Design a protein around this ligand. Structure first.
Ligand SMILES: Cc1nc(-c2ccccn2)nc(NCCc2ccccc2)c1Cl
Ligand SMILES: [Co+2]
Ligand SMILES: [Co+2]
Ligand SMILES: [Co+2]
Ligand SMILES: [K+]
Length: 304
């Protein structure tokens, strides 16, 4: 395997983390290949669940907890901490909130969150590499509670970073907020990619194409599929009661991605940097509710 940039995996990984048996688990938690029977029963289906008031309350709760655990991770982004240490803290924060960390064993993913440094587009595996000043890192969290999943992620600066890092991270966030801004009953899901790419292109950046936002609720990843690039053919129209994520992955160089030999890590084929932000949203009659919004500040961590 020819790596595309300077990053390399740092093994071995510490032994897998158990979840106290008292934490409720999703069906794939104990599946040997980590498959989700319930998600497979709806594979290829375009229909989009309309949540009930019990559901909405369930989504509100797990999404607030998820935000709390992301804020914990944020607190740890300093040079020299390893992504596995971050993951460890995150694992413990889900347990303490009586939640299961959704990524854990999902299709056999070995950790409790995804940490994606620099050229890693998404799904980086927490490992022994200490964060380096100048690095940018995304931590993507998903929690499961009472039958519901809550998902968000933010890109962070490690120490001081260069101007390009700053511009990439800022633009990406803007891409995300301009798409949220358009969410309301009646809008087609395929429209968001137009907004996202329009802003990324205007700033010299490209939009990853192999990964998309997704519906989320009782299932981790379900309809709708939400591409973040222009002129896509996403299926569906937003309706009050729909819950889904927007999570654009934007790159300094080209949009092409490839996967490391570990079967998970998605990286830019050109080795340039990538950044991402994500919120889980609920369409309401006036627009949408940002379920994973930071509550103690108006801004994401990087700009502060
Ligand atoms: C966003 C997204 N993410 C994940 C994932 C899995 C483990 C940890 C973090 N993300 N799986 C998805 N569906 C399962 C099939 C799959 C696995 C790997 C890469 C792409 C799809 C989707 Cl849609
Ligand atoms: Co994912
Ligand atoms: Co997501
Ligand atoms: Co996510
Ligand atoms: K990255």
């Amino acid at each position: 395997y020819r790596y595309t940039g300077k990053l390399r995996p740092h093994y071995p990984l510490m032994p897998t983390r158990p979840v106290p048996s008292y934490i409720q688990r999703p069906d794939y938690a104990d599946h040997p290949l980590g498959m989700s029977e319930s998600e497979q029963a709806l594979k290829g289906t375009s229909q989009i669940k309309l949540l009930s008031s019990e559901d909405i309350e369930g989504m509100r709760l797990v999404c607030r907890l998820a935000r709390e655990v992301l804020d914990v991770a944020a607190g740890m982004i300093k040079p020299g901490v390893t992504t596995e240490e971050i993951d460890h803290a995150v694992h413990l924060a889900c347990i303490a909130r009586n939640c299961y960390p959704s990524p854990l064993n999902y299709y056999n993913f070995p950790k409790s969150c995804c940490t994606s440094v620099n050229e890693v587009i998404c799904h980086g595996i927490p490992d022994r590499r200490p964060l380096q000043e100048g690095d940018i890192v995304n931590v993507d969290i998903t929690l499961y509670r009472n039958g519901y999943h809550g998902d968000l992620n933010e890109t962070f600066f490690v120490g001081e970073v260069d101007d390009g890092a700053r511009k990439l991270v800022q633009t990406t966030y803007e891409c995300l907020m301009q798409a949220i801004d358009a969410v309301k009953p009646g809008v087609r899901y395929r429209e968001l990619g137009n907004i996202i790419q329009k802003h990324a292109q205007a700033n010299g950046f490209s939009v990853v194409r192999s990964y998309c936002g997704h519906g989320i609720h009782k299932l981790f990843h379900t309809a709708p599929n939400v591409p973040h690039y222009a002129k896509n053919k996403a299926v569906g129209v937003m309706k009050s009661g729909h819950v889904f994520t927007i999570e654009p992955m934007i790159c300094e160089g080209g949009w092409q991605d490839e996967t490391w030999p570990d079967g998970w890590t998605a990286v830019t084929r050109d080795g340039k940097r990538s950044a991402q932000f994500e919120h889980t949203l609920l369409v309401t009659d006036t627009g949408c509710e940002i379920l994973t919004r930071r509550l103690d500040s108006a801004r994401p961590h990087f700009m502060s």
